[PDB]
Copies of this chain bind each other. A is one copy, B any other.
């Protein structure tokens, strides 16, 4: 079985064994979430979303349509994803940009990921980074101060 907090709104049935979804989360019906994930408080997870096994999503994260998270990924608190490069209110793209966070990668707290980004297997993104280009597998990337 899986644990959905009474104070979460989880509409998806596609949730693996051992997954925990905490207070004040929203998960829309088509989201797929694997086994032994931890979806911490105050997250939003849209429809066209795939999340693998053993994924940690810390508080305050939104996973939009077009985002895939592979197995063993860590997403730090308040990490921000995007799916529209030139957003204008009520101008809906024909297709959302796809982001994929590959197996074992980690995204530091409060990082911002631009649309269409690939972060490679076991990469490490520094806290507060802005990721405007793909990050190669096993690379440590941060936005220098």
- Assembly stoichiometry (copies): 3
Chain B residues closer than 8 Å to A124, beta-carbon distance: 86
Q: Which single residue of chain B is at the shortest CB-CB distance from A75? A: B89
Give the A interface residue count (CB, 8 A): 48
Chain B residues closer than 8 Å to A80, beta-carbon distance: 76-78, 109-110, 127-128
Interface positions of A (Cβ within 8 A of B): 7, 9, 22-24, 26, 36, 40-42, 44, 54-56, 58-60, 62, 72-74, 76-78, 80-82, 86-90, 104, 106, 108-110, 112, 114, 124, 126-128, 130, 132, 143-145
Listed by A's residue number, 8 A-B pairs whose Cβ atoms lie within 8 Å are A7-B9, A56-B89, A77-B80, A80-B127, A109-B112, A114-B127, A126-B130, A143-B145
